[PDB]
Write a protein that binds this DNA or RNA. Structure first.
Ligand SMILES: [Mg+2]
Lengths: 287, 488, 345, 130, 182, 183
RNA sequence: GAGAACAGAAAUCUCCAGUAGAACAAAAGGGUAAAAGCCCCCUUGAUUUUGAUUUUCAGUGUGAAUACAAACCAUGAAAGU
RNA sequence: GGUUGCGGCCAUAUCUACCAGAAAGCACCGUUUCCCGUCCGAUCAACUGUAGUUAAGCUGGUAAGAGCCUGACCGAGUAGUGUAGUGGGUGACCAUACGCGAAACUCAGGUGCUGCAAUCU
């Protein structure tokens, strides 16, 4: 009956958009190490992690239609495509979709020095907790490529947005650091992706409210090299960054009282020449 | 659902900025700080740095030679217990803590079937929180296994409402008073009635009071004092079950009777008079107090808690020999009694005249202080386990806190929407559970003078609430006929 | 009427946290005269009132002892209650009480002048009906009608004696029953007082209400622009109301008609030095969004309004007074000899 | 009935006006409009603020302020006007009775139905809809 | 033990997303993949940034309710949660705004005429000549009564009524299609 | 809180969630019951209740509630019961383990619609029947019934009870002592 | 496919297969699994009240619809839906 | 290393045909007074661990079994495609680079690991 109507409504756009779903497409040339890296990375994206059933021959820079079709069919605004080649090894292409139309694309290649979760210290992790972010390097806030990388990673890993957060949920922090500052004419430094488990200890340098924080890396450790980059048009940028929109001298005072200001103007009493009453005049006297 | 007004855009912009870092680099005090005992002793104007609470506790411990933590309070204005270093001679006032922490109660356990009528009274066993007895409209009384939350050893033999139920300080005998003019003693571990029901009263029993252990003869069993609506009180010997002395000085119904630690008995009656009786003098009145305009309701004493749990403590450890039990009870009584540096006990009398009076019956016959400000009658009053504060319940939906040392008003615990019937203090004195005619129970924290948590779930009015000696469990009973147990 | 779970439904349920927050806000929030209320945000104020008090009104003694018990054929009250515990205390509390009573009697007798009536047997003449105005039923009904029909009430005051003309009686009702009504003051007749006097008056009265100074005349005037701007701002505040009604409250002959006329910059309302020129309210439109209303002069009855005080105000027409001669000492007291010596020969 | 034709002008032949001769609730921000605009007239003397509500349980009855009128039968245009018209359901301030639903959400308001005809009585009586 | 952090450039925080931005200079040689101590420097920098972020987050006000479990959505009184402000970083939306508009040819007339919207009371309607309400629609609707009744005085007229209902439904569907065409 | 029932044993474990796999914070098994004196019926209703109480009290003690901690209070340990493929039937010993854990201090949100003695005619739980089930009342009743029935079954069934010289009231006493020892 | 009095090529039952050539509202990515299918138990909702668009003729500090949000509701032991 | 519980990867984990499993624990099994549900105590609920069985489940070993998976200059930096120039060709096209960039096929290998709690000759 109307069972699918609820699913369509969920897929339908809203003033407050649902949590973006991530779709991981295994490429034709995807290797075992690349598959393991993708699985480890997506483990942090749960419960918004989706894996395709079969390998797909996808050429995003030659034809973007397959990505749009996959996003439309799966309603996944975030997509990551695995790719491996002699020139571009372990190429993990990230794709964003705006209304099923490709927003931007950026190719990231994982260096061979990657470390998987199994190789790290035997420590646990909590699934579904919102990760903390720490961006290092001025290029993130100034370089267009690193600005796009920061925005994409924030939209990908931030999870659901909430105005109220629990302290117990701050179990791990995701850190992205640039491999040193750079100027024009130099290759883009690789972005270092690190995830650290948080530990709390007594400091005595401010009390309980300022506990000492220690870190324990759990990974997955990945070094991303910037490959081909695609950017949206200014019109699409403006459309995506658009508040839903869903007053002067009016303030909702505490308790909900609606108060309005009067804002009295200045009064110049130098004007208003006093009536020249016969009493004030000194022309008449009887002393 | 009416919602609090949302923050304005200016508020959001202000909150978006970082601020309020607690670095507190040096915070060297501008004025020296000295330690003085809250009770009488001044103990020394030091000028330390930003010493923490642990450092202050260590300093006090090494001053006392115990290096027994004490709670540090500032000058009593500020009246705020580095906590006080933000406001700036400065004197820090400390009181013994009797280290213990009752975990806040925030959840119930289950709704237990039982008496086919409203619950009337309840009382946790002084030695263990696993056993508890509830009196209800049904003629039968039932002891509840607080662990499994199931009935056990139902008491039968009464034919009228079980108005009041009390547990002996030794924990070996339970005394139940019913609307019928009889009192029955039951063995907690079997439910059998200890001999024939106590008889001789002409009207229903209003309250029961057990003789304190520290005053009882070594090896003997404590006596049981009872009050009746006829205005008479009988001191029943639990061994012979015969009232040795009958007192009828009160001209109207006796509201309640309290057995003091000094051996005197203080009772309130409908005659608007409070009378002090001495058991030693062949149960004879010694003094009469006449200040209440209306009848006196629910007379209470500072030592009531220690006398009730005499020879026991929150740990639940039982004494080995009667002499050891008597010594422990005497020590517990003296701890609260000697807080002033001298053996004294305070008495608070409540009445329907919208006023409560503080008395020292042994020291003087005049009221020490007058507690006033309530809009309606004060239903219930409960002295703190250490006498630090006095709390009273009134029909005006308000609960007020008063200083136990001099009766001065402290704060009002607002939040109730109906008449408050009775309240019970926590063993550690930190929390205070309360019940009202409304559908929900409430518990207050004296430290912050703020509501701790609301405990809804009762289907009707709740008339009974009690806190266990160990503080682990809190029971309740009301017109819903369902007994509810609450614990952390 | 169709049955439904609503009606036996839950509508306005509130939470404890909201109640605590509103209780804290009640004591934290403070009002500013420059700000006016627009919406009260309907709230369970009953659960937030009943602040701390230390009076404990007298207990119901009747419950403990009925009327018959206290006195009557039975009269079981054979003894006094809580009487002085000692004879010395009784003497101490009675000897001084006698002196206090004698002193109070002397203080009361210092005033009595009814003693002359008691002794000589004469009586004061009947109060003239002219001195009872403006207190008729019709004028007060018109005042209430304009108050209810005005979203904002503009109160005019006489610079000579604004405090006496304040007529607090109406203002209390305005504040209590109709908080949304601004009840803005206006200091009229500022041209007949020294500039420093008017400045001090506005400074001292601005702590509660706007209290804009004004001089009313169809010809050259003062404050017309400021008052027009204030009215335009108030109308802008009620932008969605589609209109705003403003009513002029004040004592008779206080210039309300003159104020409206100068606001209109032409003769609109009848004006005369004699009070009571305006007998019924009238609607006048300016700016197409705000309508001016002028009600008759209203005076609140009070025993402290002895005819001498009323007459020196513009309340009563001096034509109908029986003995105008006896009031000259009052005008002498109220005015310096220099001013009369200049005006009067 | 309940709509008395009111005639205005020197020659009373253009009434165009209606007056509600029955008790009505007019909210808190009533603020009569200009004479020329008002057609339906509800006199202040007929405006009720507090209604007498009887509690079906406990047999207790309290005088509580009226909050709003939700459903008046017989052309609920009268509901919009806020007329009582015995048989109407009106909101009442139940905070005084201290009714608390499960979960600690104390109820300060609830529906009530007027049981007496205010036209012939100087008071409003309603039965609380528990 | 130390928890205070000092940097040449203050750290820019984004509390709405639990994110912190550090613009301080980074040494290329130290972070080079060939460096054995590469991991240690990144770990220390991340530790400092996380310490600053945690201090800022704990500096925020936190809610403190006094209710019970009750509705599972609300937080218990024991719990206290930091009130994170609205996000400061702007992120692109995944879909365009759904603010499509169409008057359906009915709203235009309703605005032109003085036709106020119906109060939308409910389905219940009194069915005269019977002691039951039988709402207008929703269940055992009175509109179906003509089919179940026994005599239809003045081809079966019940079939005619059913055909009329079908025609009205099809007309409504056609109007919906016409409005969708716009 | 994962509770699973196998032949001759009961498995109860408090389990968290992690990407690498579930992690157990505490565990308890019915085979440890003999440590408290319970030698028979390790997979029965009373044994399930005892195991639930034991695991609840053990995890409560390990967590520091008895005998990043900032932002008081102690935040009691709330846990959701998981029974896997076990059928949802009123009176099942899995609900007995749930009740034992609840009595032990683990506040699992649960209604009393499936505890033993819950009748469908009246929406009220019979506390007497629940107590009897908790204290092995049904086992004692069965032993009493067999005391006058065919002895061959009584010699095969409850053979351990006869070897240990157990009786109707002794079973309840042993269960109470085991609960005390667990506490 | 293997077997069962009437009963056979199609009647109903038992067993082994069935990636699903089950009914899934959907075409369809090809999806949906101890289900979105089949069997059984409980259930009303067009519930109110706050906020931004629309309307008017006592512009209704609310009389109503629309969207959002919050209480409330159904179910289960629960997570949750 | 075997095993039970909870899981991650989700066929190197599956399907057909054959063989073994010391101790422990799974598993079958024995019972219907109680809680519990079915036409059927078959399923499920409860009791028993007592009367047994490793037959079966499960684990393990084998087939050059079917499928499945992995590394690869093997296809290959090849094909294909794209962008540029009076280079030849009247043009289309041909030769070059200049950026993306395949797959079949083929060579070789393999037929489960792993996270936490507990237990076993
Ligand atoms: Mg005049």
């Amino acid at each position: 009956n109307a069972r699918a109507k609820r699913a369509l409504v969920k897929r339908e756009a809203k003033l407050v958009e649902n949590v973006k779903q991530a779709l991981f497409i295994p490429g034709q040339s995807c290797n075992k190490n690349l598959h393991d890296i993708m699985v480890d990375l997506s483990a942090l994206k749960k419960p918004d992690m989706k894996r395709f059933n079969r390998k797909n021959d996808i050429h995003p820079f030659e034809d973007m239609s397959p990505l749009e079709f996959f996003s439309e069919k799966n309603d996944c605004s975030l997509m990551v495509l695995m790719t491996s080649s002699k020139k571009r090894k372990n190429n993990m292409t990230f794709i964003r979709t705006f209304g099923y139309k490709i927003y931007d694309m950026i190719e990231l290649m994982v260096a061979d020095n990657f470390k998987l979760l199994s190789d790290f210290k035997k420590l646990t992790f909590t699934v579904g907790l919102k990760p903390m972010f720490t961006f290092q390097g001025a290029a993130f806030d100034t370089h267009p490529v690193y600005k796009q990388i920061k925005s994409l990673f924030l939209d990908f890993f931030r999870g659901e947005s909430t105005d109220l957060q629990d302290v117990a949920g701050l179990q791990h922090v995701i850190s992205m650091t640039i491999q040193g500052d750079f100027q024009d004419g130099e290759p883009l430094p690789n972005v270092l992706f690190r995830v650290y488990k948080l530990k709390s200890y007594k400091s005595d340098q401010g009390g309980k409210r300022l506990p000492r924080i220690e870190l324990v890396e759990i990974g997955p450790r990945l070094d991303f090299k910037i490959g081909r980059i695609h950017t949206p048009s200014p019109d699409m940028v403006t459309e995506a960054h658009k508040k839903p929109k869903q007053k002067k001298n009016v303030e909702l005072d505490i308790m909900g009282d609606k108060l309005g200001r009067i804002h009295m103007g200045k009064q110049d009493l130098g004007k208003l020449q006093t009536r020249k009453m016969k009493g004030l005049k000194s022309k008449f006297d009887q002393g | 659902s009416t919602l609090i007004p949302p923050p304005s855009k200016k508020q959001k912009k202000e909150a978006q900025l970082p601020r309020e870092v607690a670095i507190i680099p040096k915070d060297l005090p501008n004025v020296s700080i000295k330690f003085q005992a809250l009770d009488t002793g001044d103990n020394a104007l030091r000028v330390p740095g930003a010493i923490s609470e642990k450092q202050l506790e260590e300093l006090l411990n090494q001053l006392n030679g115990t290096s027994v933590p004490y709670t540090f309070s500032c000058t009593i204005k500020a009246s705020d217990p580095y906590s006080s270093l933000i406001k700036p001679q400065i004197t820090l006032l400390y009181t013994p803590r009797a280290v213990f922490k009752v975990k806040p109660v925030t959840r119930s356990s289950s709704a237990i079937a039982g008496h086919g009528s409203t619950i009337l009274c309840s009382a946790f066993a002084p030695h263990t929180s696993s056993r508890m007895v509830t009196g209800a409209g049904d003629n039968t009384a039932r002891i509840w296994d607080c662990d499994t939350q199931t009935p056990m050893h139902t008491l039968k033999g009464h034919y009228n409402w079980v108005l009041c139920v009390s547990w002996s300080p030794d924990g070996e005998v339970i005394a139940t008073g019913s609307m019928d003019n009889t009192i029955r003693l039951w063995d907690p571990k079997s439910g059998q009635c200890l001999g024939d029901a106590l008889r001789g009263h002409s009207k229903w029993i209003t309250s029961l009071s057990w003789e304190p252990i520290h005053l009882v003869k070594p090896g003997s069993k404590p006596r049981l004092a009872s009050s009746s609506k006829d205005g008479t009180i009988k001191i029943w010997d639990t061994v012979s079950r015969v009232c040795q002395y009958t007192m009828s000085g009160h001209t109207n119904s006796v509201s309640c009777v309290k057995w003091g630690g000094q051996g005197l008995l203080y009772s309130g009656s409908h005659d608007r008079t409070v009378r002090v009786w001495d058991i030693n003098s062949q149960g004879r009145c010694i003094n009469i107090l006449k200040s209440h305009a209306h009848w006196v309701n629910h007379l209470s004493l500072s030592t009531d808690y220690a006398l009730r749990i005499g020879a026991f403590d929150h740990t639940g450890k039982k004494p080995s020999t009667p002499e050891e039990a008597q010594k422990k009870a005497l020590e517990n009584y003296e701890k609260i009694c000697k807080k002033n540096g001298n053996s004294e006990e305070m008495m608070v009398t409540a009445s329907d005249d919208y006023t409560m009076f503080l008395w020292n019956p042994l020291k003087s016959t005049k009221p020490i202080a007058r507690m006033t400000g309530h809009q309606k009658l004060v239903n219930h009053v409960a002295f703190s386990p250490d006498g630090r504060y006095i709390v009273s319940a009134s029909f005006d939906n308000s609960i007020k806190l008063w200083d136990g040392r001099d009766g001065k008003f402290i704060s009002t615990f607002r939040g109730h929407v109906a008449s408050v019937y009775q309240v019970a203090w926590s063993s550690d004195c930190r929390l205070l559970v309360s019940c009202s005619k409304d559908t929900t129970l409430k518990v207050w924290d004296v430290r912050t003078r703020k509501l701790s948590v609301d405990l809804p779930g009762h289907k009707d009015e709740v008339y009974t609430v009690d806190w266990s000696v160990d503080g682990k469990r809190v029971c309740s009973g009301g017109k819903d006929k369902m007994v509810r147990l609450w614990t952390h | 009427v169709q049955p439904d779970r609503r009606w036996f439904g839950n509508t306005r349920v509130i939470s404890q946290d909201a109640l605590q927050h509103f209780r804290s806000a009640l004591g934290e929030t403070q009002k500013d005269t420059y700000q006016v209320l627009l919406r009260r945000n309907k709230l369970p104020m009953s659960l937030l009132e009943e602040k701390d008090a230390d009076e404990s009104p007298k207990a119901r003694i009747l419950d403990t002892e009925s009327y018959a018990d206290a006195f009557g054929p039975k009269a079981q009250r054979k003894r006094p209650r809580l009487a002085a515990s000692n004879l010395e205390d009784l003497v101490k509390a009675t000897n001084e009480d006698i002196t206090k009573y004698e002193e109070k009697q002397v203080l009361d007798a210092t005033l009595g002048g009814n003693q002359e009536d008691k002794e000589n047997g004469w009586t004061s003449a009947a109060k003239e009906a002219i001195f009872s105005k403006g207190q008729s039923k019709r004028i007060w009904n018109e005042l209430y009608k304009v108050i209810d029909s005005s979203d904002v009430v503009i109160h005019v005051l006489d610079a000579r004696d604004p405090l006496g003309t304040r007529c607090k009686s109406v203002e209390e009702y305005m504040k209590k029953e109709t908080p949304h009504k601004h009840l803005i003051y206006v200091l009229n007749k500022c041209d007949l007082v020294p500039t420093w006097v008017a400045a001090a008056w506005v400074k001292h009265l601005s702590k509660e209400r706007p209290t804009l100074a004004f001089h009313a005349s169809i010809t050259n005037s003062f404050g017309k622009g400021s008052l027009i701007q204030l009215l335009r701002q108030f109308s802008q505040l009620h932008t969605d109301r589609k209109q705003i009604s403003v009513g002029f409250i004040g004592y008779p002959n206080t210039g309300k008609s003159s104020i409206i006329n100068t606001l209109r910059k032409k003769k609109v309302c009848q004006v005369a030095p004699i009070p009571g020129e305006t007998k019924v309210w009238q609607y006048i439109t300016l700016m197409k969004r705000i309508f001016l209303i002028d009600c008759p002069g209203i005076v609140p009855p009070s025993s402290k309004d002895s005819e001498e005080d009323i007459l020196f105000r513009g309340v009563v027409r001096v034509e109908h007074v029986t003995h105008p001669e006896q009031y000259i000492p009052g005008v002498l007291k109220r005015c310096q000899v220099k001013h009369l010596e200049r005006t009067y020969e | 009935e309940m709509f008395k034709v009111i005639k205005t002008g020197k020659s009373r032949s253009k009434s165009w006006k209606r007056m509600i001769t029955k008790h009505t609730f007019v909210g808190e921000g009533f603020t009569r409009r200009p004479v020329k605009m008002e057609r339906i007239i509800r006199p202040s003397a007929l405006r009720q603020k507090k209604a007498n509500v009887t509690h079906p349980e406990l047999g207790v009855t309290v005088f509580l302020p009226i909050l709003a009128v939700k459903k008046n039968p017989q052309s609920p245009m009268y509901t919009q006007l806020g007329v009582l018209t015995k048989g109407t359901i009106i909101e009442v301030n139940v905070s005084e009775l201290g009714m608390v639903t499960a979960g600690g959400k104390v109820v300060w308001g609830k529906y009530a139905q007027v049981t007496n005809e205010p036209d012939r009585d100087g008071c409003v009586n309603a039965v609380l809809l528990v | 033990l130390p928890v205070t952090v000092e940097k040449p450039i203050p750290v820019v925080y984004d509390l709405g997303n639990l994110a912190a931005f550090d613009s301080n200079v980074l040494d290329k040689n130290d972070l080079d993949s060939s460096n054995a101590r590469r991991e240690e420097k990144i770990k220390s920098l991340t530790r400092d940034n996380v310490q600053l972020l945690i201090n800022q987050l704990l500096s925020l006000p936190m809610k403190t309710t006094t209710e019970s479990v009750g509705g599972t959505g609300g937080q218990s009184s024991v719990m206290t949660l930091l009130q994170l402000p609205d996000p400061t970083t702007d992120l692109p939306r995944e879909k365009p705004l759904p603010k499509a508009k169409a008057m359906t040819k009915w709203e235009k007339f309703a605005a032109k005429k003085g036709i106020k919207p119906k109060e939308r009371a409910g389905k219940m309607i009194y069915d005269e000549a019977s002691g039951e309400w039988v709402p207008k629609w929703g269940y055992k609707g009175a509109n179906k009564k003509l089919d179940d009744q026994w005599l239809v005085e003045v081809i079966d007229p019940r079939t005619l009524n059913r055909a009329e209902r079908k025609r009205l439904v099809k007309k409504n569907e056609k109007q919906q299609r016409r409005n969708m065409k716009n | 809180l994962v509770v699973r029932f196998t032949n001759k044993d009961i498995i109860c474990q408090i389990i968290s969630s992690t990407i690498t796999g579930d992690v157990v914070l505490a565990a308890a098994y019915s085979h440890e019951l003999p440590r408290y004196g319970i030698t028979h019926g390790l997979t029965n209703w009373a044994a399930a209740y005892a195991t639930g109480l034991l695991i609840a009290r053990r995890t409560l003690q390990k967590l520091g509630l008895d005998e990043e901690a900032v932002e008081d209070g102690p935040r009691p340990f709330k846990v959701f019961l998981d029974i896997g493929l076990q059928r949802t039937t009123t009176g099942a010993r899995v609900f007995g383990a749930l009740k034992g854990a609840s009595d032990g201090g683990l506040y699992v949100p649960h209604s009393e619609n499936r505890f033993p003695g819950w009748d469908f005619e009246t929406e009220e739980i019979d506390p007497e029947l629940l107590r009897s089930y908790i204290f092995g009342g049904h086992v004692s009743q069965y032993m009493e019934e067999l005391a006058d029935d065919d002895e061959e079954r009584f010699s095969e069934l409850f053979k351990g009870y006869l070897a240990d010289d157990i009786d109707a009231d002794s079973l309840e006493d042993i269960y109470t002592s085991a609960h005390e020892a667990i506490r």
